[PDB]
Amino acid sequence: AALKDQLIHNLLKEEHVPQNKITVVGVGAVGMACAISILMKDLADELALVDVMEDKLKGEMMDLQHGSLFLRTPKIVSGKDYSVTANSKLVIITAGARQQEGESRLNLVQRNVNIFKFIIPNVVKYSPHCKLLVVSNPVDILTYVAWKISGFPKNRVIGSGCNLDSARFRYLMGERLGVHALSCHGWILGEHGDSSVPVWSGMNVAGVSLKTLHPELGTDADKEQWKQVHKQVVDSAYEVIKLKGYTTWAIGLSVADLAESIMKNLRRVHPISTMLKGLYGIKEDVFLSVPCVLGQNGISDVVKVTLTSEEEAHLKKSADTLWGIQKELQF
Amino acid sequence: AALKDQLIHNLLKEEHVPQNKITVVGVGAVGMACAISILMKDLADELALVDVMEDKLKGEMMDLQHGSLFLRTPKIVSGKDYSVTANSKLVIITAGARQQEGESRLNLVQRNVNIFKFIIPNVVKYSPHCKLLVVSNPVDILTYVAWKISGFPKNRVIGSGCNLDSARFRYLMGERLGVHALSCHGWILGEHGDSSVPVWSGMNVAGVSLKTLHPELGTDADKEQWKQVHKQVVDSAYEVIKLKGYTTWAIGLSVADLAESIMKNLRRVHPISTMLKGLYGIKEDVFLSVPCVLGQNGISDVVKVTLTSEEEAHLKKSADTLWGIQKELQF
Amino acid sequence: AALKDQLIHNLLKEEHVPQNKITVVGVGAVGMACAISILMKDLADELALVDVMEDKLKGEMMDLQHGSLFLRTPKIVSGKDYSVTANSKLVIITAGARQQEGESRLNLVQRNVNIFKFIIPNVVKYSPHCKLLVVSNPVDILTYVAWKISGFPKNRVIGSGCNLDSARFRYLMGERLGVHALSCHGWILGEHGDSSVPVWSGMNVAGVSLKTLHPELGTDADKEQWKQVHKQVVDSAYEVIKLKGYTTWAIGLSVADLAESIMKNLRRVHPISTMLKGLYGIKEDVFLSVPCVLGQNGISDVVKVTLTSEEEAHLKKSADTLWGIQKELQF
Amino acid sequence: AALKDQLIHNLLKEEHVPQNKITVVGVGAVGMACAISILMKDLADELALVDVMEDKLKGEMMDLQHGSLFLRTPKIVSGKDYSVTANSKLVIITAGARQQEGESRLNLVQRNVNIFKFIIPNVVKYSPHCKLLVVSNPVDILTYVAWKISGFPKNRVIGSGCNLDSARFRYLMGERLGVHALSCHGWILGEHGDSSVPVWSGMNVAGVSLKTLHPELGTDADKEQWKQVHKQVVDSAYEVIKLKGYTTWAIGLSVADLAESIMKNLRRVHPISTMLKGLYGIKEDVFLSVPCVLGQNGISDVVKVTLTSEEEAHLKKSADTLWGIQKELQF
């Protein structure tokens, strides 16, 4: 007898199961950039959002909601309570402290391990079967922390790790060479940030090995100084942060990418972080970035890059370093 | 080892159960345009094809698989045997006889009624929970035939109905008004074909009603002959068939559109073909195009349109053509 | 024998003129949301950003470039100098004066006037053939200021206007109705903000007027009370500002939809802000929101809606006050 | 009194020269597949079709137009007369003689030479400033012919080449490895068809060279017989034509991708067919596939792959044949 009723004759009794649901935890700069790129790539049929800052949270949800006319994600929901979160296929954690200008990512660790103690039990409790994508820094360490607190088998705990570093290196390499990044190939592995490993042997355009063409590639004999390029990758979070206070867009895009392979079962290979005890020389429970095949069940295989001898020693030190820190943590 | 086994180290016992599968039954002109459109709107993580022509079936599948670098649908499969169809969310039927130049859609009924006797029982054996979308002609009778045989509740059996009629209309309108079809509104309802009803009362640009502006919209004594725009719509199939032999591009797009609403659960309203017994002054169980809310459980609500005496008149006549041709059926 | 030349043989000397370039002026939350939305829709082959805050603007530029791999817009540039802006088809202004509390809303305007008296001449100098889209508030006055300063003909100076109020209206409408905003229609015309006009007669789903079904619509004694909806719509950004301190996402999505019409030449109707002396019984040089055909040459036609005469008055009385302000400005 | 003028107030008139136009010459299976793929990737604001069969042509145009509601290319036109082609940025040539009953090769080549002596002058006469993409077979010779009849600079005359060959190879590479083709790289170079060169040295996943991991790769004595894979790629059309009667989909998807790099100015590397006298030791006016930087001005740069003595041998040889057939053509 309502207006609505004179107009829509109903015929089917309404229950709901979201069929392709993503959750972003943390709606700060990174969480919101991840949100917008997911919405614009149509990866979900439900997006849920949680954060402890209630007003910001509800303010961001409405901003996004008022743009539904222009999206094809028919449902956007939010809450402090994880129930809004239930049955997500994918949950992205972007919650936590971030670097002040000058600050290392490692100084972040104690603050964000506490945050994780609280979040991860609540996520795995409403979405027992999700894939977890970890973005908060220091990301390898925090990926491990998510792994341990949750109980999940390890194909299902994923860290973004060097996906960003690698995307920045390919951006700088095309810019040097004058070719789109889509066409410059090249892998940054190991730890996100200070001590990632640039794998010079597999850099190429059109299958054309750059280091075979130019044997000094990335040493100190290099007159054309391709170390400065990795160095520029290393130093970019600091340079962006110093300029605009934080980084948001590049990681949002890079995270939407990772979700795409998850939601569409693509099986593309990404430099992401995973639990690699048993491989690359490593015996501790550490997360580092290595090329991983990513699809609807998380990481199911790992490509076995052929590393030089120092390159495997770079990796082993990071494994040593990460574990010394982890030894000390408490769950 | 194998090359593969030296390159990729496996971590996760593969075990594939499909998440967003679409199946297309009939790989003729319409089936294949649906396939390329669905593939290009990224709506499936898996596409299955069936047909009775083995060679044809497998050359179409191979041809699709080869453009696969430029797609984001990781698995394309086909088979004469319907087990390649198992667990599809949406099965689309585009199998059977089409019109020769000059020929009525309803003249194809008998040949295709028989084809559906073979086809439908096989679909619902492999995909018992699926939504069926019928494209084959006469699409309204065949929708009813798919529903009786299959035994599915009515929400789950959808005729592409007047979705294409409405979209030709909007196109011819915008052409006359100088404005994109996206911005010209107006509905064709009833039978997909000779007895579709133009709802002149609801045509508009921007909320401004066209028959109010110009009262002889839709009668024969109108100086600028707007009635030949619905003349043009019904004659559409017969003109294009006469020129290129069949129609393909427009149905595929139209079909991928409805496919989009279903897989993403948009809940848009389309003029599609549903069992409207009990609604719209109609007491027999026939299918015909009416505005329908379309989501992941199929059709859930119908919009009640205010039709005149005449508009309301044609429908039950549209509705009885199809009637008289229906309970007279051996299946 | 540097490395770029060892690998790549150059066959052509590159006098790059960009073909579908877009500029965004101001890189605050709003402008950086038009930017990422434009970038995600593959509308431009080059994106220029300008702003007087140098570091912020450089940091936002690199944050975007860093995500190049994931975008299809090969060149992003930035500077204080509008020469980076050269050759744009479309220029989007989101810049304006920090807000001056307890101060007349005519010092305020006249201050923006002062920003525009620098901005507008520079944009038009480097992009003579471009199209300006004004978003900065107060949008109708400032659109007027840009028309004045630039000297452009009126079809090429567009205010974002009620574009977003109406997306908001259709969101809240669908929500009350249980249907995608894509399928609800409804127009909010006039002055962006407190003084806008919900056109009740044009509100429909599937061509069925809601005013006619339930003819008390939008009334005070409309027990079923849809002025709520319109009030929500005007209260809309105070509430969001109150919660997150600004609004961005929905304006960026909204502006990116206008950009798409203009860039692809669609000729869809949007409720935007155009100079409409001569129409709607407005005799002053005033920008009001009306339904406009928008395409590659700006706004080329206007849809003449039939207003109730109280609707008319709101509009006339709007122009009266806008003009009372514009007339006191020094230019 | 006209309905159009009671509704729309016109604000400006008819300086209409399209900005991002594309023409497809030839509306057989391939022509139409390039057309649908271009339409669904939104790369043009106008699409024109040409062909000598007038009915088919008209009829395909119309089929497409009825699809407008679901597309965003507001304008589709067609005719036997090349004036509909005026102002194209890209012209795509898919027309040619139907092959015959094993007549000579001169004899196949020259009969398209004769079709091209009509088609090319007409295209350039109306779009003097365009890029030409030739897709017709034999493609490397018919690209030369097109370059020759047209007088264009060689950056602006491009052949399809081994683009689809490489695509098919990566697909098959991917099927063996369990990874999406997007993540498998390898390059088929030289002359299209059986004389093509699979460049074994640069095949890889995540930068790890298959060659170094697997020594006997692309050798006959190869236990795994990866060589049989380049065999499949070169046999692929014979086998697809043998099954379904012709090939369409994969080729049109692959041409739409070249189109995008051209229209969006991406400067990605594709293996396409180019005039390379002066590179790879080539001697005569001849077209061979080579990795090529593709943008808004055609091919501007070329990648120098390090080929084996034997591999240069295959390329230099093709160059000799190409030239032997060419030096006798009649123009």
Ligand SMILES: NC(=O)C1=CN([C@@H]2O[C@H](COP(=O)(O)OP(=O)(O)OC[C@H]3O[C@@H](n4cnc5c(N)ncnc54)[C@H](O)[C@@H]3O)[C@@H](O)[C@H]2O)C=CC1
């Ligand atoms: N892995 C990578 O490549 C990158 C990582 N990051 C990291 O992302 C993390 C977040 O960064 P931003 O968004 O820039 O900072 P931000 O400060 O804007 O947002 C942090 C958000 O998380 C929220 N939060 C804090 N405790 C919470 C809890 N218990 N539950 C829910 N929400 C909580 C805060 O309320 C705030 O809204 C930082 O750790 C930053 O280091 C940033 C960029 C790149």
Ligand SMILES: NC(=O)C1=CN([C@@H]2O[C@H](COP(=O)(O)OP(=O)(O)OC[C@H]3O[C@@H](n4cnc5c(N)ncnc54)[C@H](O)[C@@H]3O)[C@@H](O)[C@H]2O)C=CC1
């Ligand atoms: N609803 C609509 O608005 C439209 C409907 N159509 C209809 O679509 C139908 C298909 O037409 P086209 O695609 O042009 O025909 P087509 O003849 O090119 O292809 C039809 C395919 O049906 C297959 N087929 C026949 N029996 C089969 C079975 N038991 N299982 C699997 N496949 C079987 C054939 O082998 C053939 O490949 C026709 O009835 C035509 O009228 C066409 C355009 C629009």
Ligand SMILES: NC(=O)C1=CN([C@@H]2O[C@H](COP(=O)(O)OP(=O)(O)OC[C@H]3O[C@@H](n4cnc5c(N)ncnc54)[C@H](O)[C@@H]3O)[C@@H](O)[C@H]2O)C=CC1
């Ligand atoms: N009409 C609409 O729907 C809406 C309009 N807006 C308008 O958009 C504008 C942007 O809002 P926010 O981005 O939230 O503000 P914001 O203050 O964070 O940044 C505005 C940007 O303009 C820059 N700017 C100031 N003067 C400039 C100059 N002379 N040249 C170049 N850049 C200059 C500032 O430095 C600042 O980065 C506001 O004026 C607001 O009124 C905002 C929301 C909605």
Ligand SMILES: NC(=O)C1=CN([C@@H]2O[C@H](COP(=O)(O)OP(=O)(O)OC[C@H]3O[C@@H](n4cnc5c(N)ncnc54)[C@H](O)[C@@H]3O)[C@@H](O)[C@H]2O)C=CC1
């Ligand atoms: N090399 C490559 O990478 C590939 C090339 N191709 C080529 O593309 C075409 C594929 O064949 P189909 O799609 O079956 O097309 P088709 O050759 O069967 O039809 C194209 C149209 O050209 C028309 N035509 C003939 N002369 C004309 C003229 N003077 N002006 C305008 N139109 C004219 C014909 O009437 C015909 O419909 C073939 O010629 C083939 O060589 C096809 C696949 C791959």
